[PDB]
Design an enzyme around this catalytic site. Structure first.
Site, mmCIF file in Angstrom:
data_model
loop_
_atom_site.group_PDB
_atom_site.id
_atom_site.type_symbol
_atom_site.label_atom_id
_atom_site.label_comp_id
_atom_site.label_asym_id
_atom_site.label_seq_id
_atom_site.Cartn_x
_atom_site.Cartn_y
_atom_site.Cartn_z
ATOM 1 N N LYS B 20 -18.756 -3.133 -23.517
ATOM 2 C CA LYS B 20 -18.408 -3.553 -22.158
ATOM 3 C C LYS B 20 -16.981 -4.106 -22.128
ATOM 4 C CE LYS B 20 -23.134 -4.745 -20.771
ATOM 5 N NZ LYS B 20 -24.025 -5.805 -20.223
ATOM 6 N N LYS B 36 -12.838 -6.162 -24.771
ATOM 7 C CA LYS B 36 -13.951 -5.267 -25.120
ATOM 8 C C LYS B 36 -14.993 -6.068 -25.900
ATOM 9 C CE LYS B 36 -12.975 -1.022 -26.552
ATOM 10 N NZ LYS B 36 -12.555 0.093 -27.445
ATOM 11 N N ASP B 131 -10.709 11.629 -32.673
ATOM 12 C CA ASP B 131 -11.417 11.570 -31.381
ATOM 13 C C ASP B 131 -10.436 11.621 -30.196
ATOM 14 O OD1 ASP B 131 -13.950 11.471 -30.000
ATOM 15 O OD2 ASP B 131 -13.697 9.322 -29.661
ATOM 16 N N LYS B 133 -9.021 12.899 -26.868
ATOM 17 C CA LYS B 133 -9.584 13.479 -25.642
ATOM 18 C C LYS B 133 -9.058 12.761 -24.400
ATOM 19 C CE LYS B 133 -13.801 10.705 -26.155
ATOM 20 N NZ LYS B 133 -15.282 10.766 -26.137
ATOM 21 N N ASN B 136 -9.929 9.074 -23.688
ATOM 22 C CA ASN B 136 -9.367 8.141 -24.677
ATOM 23 C C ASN B 136 -7.846 7.932 -24.544
ATOM 24 O OD1 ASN B 136 -11.945 7.801 -25.716
ATOM 25 N ND2 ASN B 136 -11.421 8.442 -27.808
HETATM 26 C C1 LIG Z 1 -13.301 2.112 -18.605
HETATM 27 C C2 LIG Z 1 -12.209 1.363 -19.332
HETATM 28 C C3 LIG Z 1 -11.501 0.364 -18.675
HETATM 29 C C4 LIG Z 1 -10.488 -0.341 -19.336
HETATM 30 C C5 LIG Z 1 -10.184 -0.033 -20.650
HETATM 31 C C6 LIG Z 1 -10.898 0.977 -21.329
HETATM 32 C C7 LIG Z 1 -11.906 1.684 -20.660
HETATM 33 N N1 LIG Z 1 -12.653 2.694 -21.337
HETATM 34 C C8 LIG Z 1 -12.160 3.267 -22.607
HETATM 35 C C9 LIG Z 1 -12.926 4.558 -23.033
HETATM 36 N N2 LIG Z 1 -11.610 5.201 -23.196
HETATM 37 C C10 LIG Z 1 -10.891 4.154 -22.439
HETATM 38 N N3 LIG Z 1 -9.158 -0.762 -21.311
HETATM 39 C C11 LIG Z 1 -8.212 -1.438 -20.524
HETATM 40 N N4 LIG Z 1 -7.165 -1.968 -21.061
HETATM 41 N N5 LIG Z 1 -6.899 -1.852 -22.428
HETATM 42 C C12 LIG Z 1 -7.834 -1.377 -23.291
HETATM 43 O O1 LIG Z 1 -7.578 -1.285 -24.470
HETATM 44 C C13 LIG Z 1 -9.209 -0.974 -22.778
HETATM 45 C C14 LIG Z 1 -10.216 -2.081 -23.097
HETATM 46 C C15 LIG Z 1 -8.451 -1.582 -19.013
HETATM 47 O O2 LIG Z 1 -9.813 -1.294 -18.676
#
Ligand SMILES: Cc1cc2c(cc1NC1CNC1)N1C(=NNC(=O)[C@H]1C)CO2
Ligand SMILES: Cc1cc2c(cc1NC1CNC1)N1C(=NNC(=O)[C@H]1C)CO2
Ligand code: NA
Lengths: 333, 309
Positions: B20, B36, B131, B133, B136
């Protein structure tokens, strides 16, 4: 007051500083330059305090003939607006790209007007820290206006110093690079860099990366071409002294330097010495002296990160709203 | 040493297979971050202990590079694992592909160039990413790309080192992985080809109604190139979709010297001097909510960037 009360005709520029629009208040034929920032961008960039410093300094700067005048500031949920005087002379970076370098009398005139602006700031305990060609605007007649006060340090009168690393790389003083506590001395090193670039048409310090550039600033001797006037060279040598307390501007009397020998300083402050260069300006709303890339783009304010703005502390930009007596008279009528 | 009480969780940005993601504010400074959050018991169930530690170890190395997601610090409670990341609200590339179907040649070239820089940094540090894609790749607020989610990486891949575990997202997996071969960084360059193909064309190069058919297509079918596709874009993709790793571009030759990246000044790109051709219009294209509520040794870490703040 709101942004809907202005008609945004054209965008004069965008970048890290936000978006600058040529704005007309209602249909009164009264034009302004509006710097429009987005609060969420300001928060992520860590420019909250910098924005407030800009408001405060512009509140001091409405007196002085060679600092940009701010008529009013105001804010919405997403936006921060500065309503400035519209200066359509063009900045010095724009003019120097065209002509490569400024002639001696033109560089001297600019140097002299910049000295008055800086000495005023220093007298109010303000160290400017971001002196550079694209932060110097011209008005319709060709007098300089110093701009962008967000990088200032206030409360620097007396035996006061500060230590934070800031400025534009080409202009950063060695005392900042060496991590020393510093005062207004940093502006006079930058002044020397600006003066060198006006006269010579390139920067005095160079490098392929920042590391070499900072080494050059710390260690390398500035190059003075054979054709350069001797009193121009002398001033630059007196400005490029790395020991801050022995630098002209900190030490001595920079106004009495032989480069400004023909300059009556009281006349210059009263705007009574004609600028050697007068820009082409057809009207009070002319946009000739700006990059054409931005001008053609349609004027608009971006959307905001709603999740950030709702989660934001609202009182970060407290005491941001300002309005001089002129703006109140040209609103209620 | 930092703790979760030092932050204030404001709003939830995402939830699923990657734990999350929470938008969090630091106590006094009012500095916003993406955090995260992984449940330890969930991670132990899925057998992603090594994956989580590889993520931490790679994110420690990745603080320097401009087109990798910056991790400020990591820490753990009794039940949770936290990664304090820079908040990147531009949106992922899967969202932007879904918005406009395909990216134009300039936009596709820019994103492809920045991904090459990020991949080649990891490869020089001995990290095969595995990975790559659309979902990502995150964009920052300016429009620059940020490679995220390093949990599927393999470390110590310098010189003639190889690995053999089956992994990656089905559409992007290389033939050598499907053929059960000992592979190296070549697998990233296949995936790069697939990602580049999707940006230009707006569909995947290999298809199937199930995995069995999809993997057969990846092993056997040559991709379709439409007539309207630019010859330089086609040429790079053809050189990228070579099934023998040693002959593949990225492994062989210099991928930066290809005619597709003719106008790209690589140093100016790496310093972030070239502005992105697309700035995001919608800000934070992510689902937002209210808040509500010893195998992981040596997980704690703090980058010297966070030590300043
Ligand atoms: C869905 C998603 C939202 C996010 C972020 C990531 C996601 N999902 C991941 C799945 N590939 C992007 N991030 C963000 N900032 N920096 C980050 O490293 C990550 C935590 C901003 O919000
Ligand atoms: C790009 C740009 C254009 C501008 C102006 C500024 C900029 N950009 C800034 C970045 N340095 C000058 N201004 C002008 N008048 N007065 C002002 O205070 C400011 C808003 C005229 O137009
Ligand atoms: Na040098």
């Amino acid at each position: 007051l709101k942004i809907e009360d202005f008609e945004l005709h054209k965008m004069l520029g965008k970048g890290s500083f936000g978006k600058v629009f040529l704005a007309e208040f209602k249909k009164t034929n009264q034009f302004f330059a509006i710097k429009a920032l987005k609060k969420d961008v300001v928060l992520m960039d860590d420019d909250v305090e910098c924005t407030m410093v800009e408001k405060r300094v512009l509140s001091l700067a409405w007196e002085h003939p060679f600092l940009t005048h701010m008529f009013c500031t105001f804010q919405t949920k997403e936006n921060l607006f500065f309503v400035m005087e519209y200066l359509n002379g063009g900045d010095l970076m724009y003019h120097i790209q065209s002509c490569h370098k400024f002639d001696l009398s033109r560089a001297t005139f600019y140097a002299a007007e910049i000295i008055l602006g800086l000495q005023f700031l220093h007298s109010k305990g303000i160290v400017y820290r971001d002196l550079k060609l694209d932060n110097i605007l011209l008005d319709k007649d060709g007098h300089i206006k110093i701009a962008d006060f967000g990088m200032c340090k206030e409360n620097m009168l007396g035996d006061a110093k500060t230590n934070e690393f800031c400025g534009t790389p080409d202009y950063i003083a060695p005392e900042i690079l060496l991590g020393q506590k510093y005062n207004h001395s940093v502006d006079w090193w930058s002044f020397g860099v600006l003066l060198y670039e006006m006269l010579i048409g390139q920067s005095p310090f160079h490098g392929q990366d920042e590391e070499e550039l900072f080494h050059s600033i710390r260690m390398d001797n500035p190059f003075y071409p054979r054709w350069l006037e001797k009193e121009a060279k002398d001033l630059l040598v007196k400005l490029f002294v790395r020991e801050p307390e022995k630098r002209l501007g900190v030490r001595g009397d920079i106004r009495q330097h032989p480069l400004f020998r023909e300059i009556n300083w009281e006349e210059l402050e009263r705007k009574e010495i004609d600028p050697p260069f007068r820009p082409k300006v057809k009207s009070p709303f002319d946009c000739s002296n700006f990059d054409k890339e931005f001008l053609n783009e349609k004027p608009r304010l971006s959307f905001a990160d709603r999740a950030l703005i709702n989660s934001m502390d609202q009182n970060m930009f407290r005491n941001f709203s300002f309005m001089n007596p002129g703006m109140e008279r040209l609103i209620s009528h």
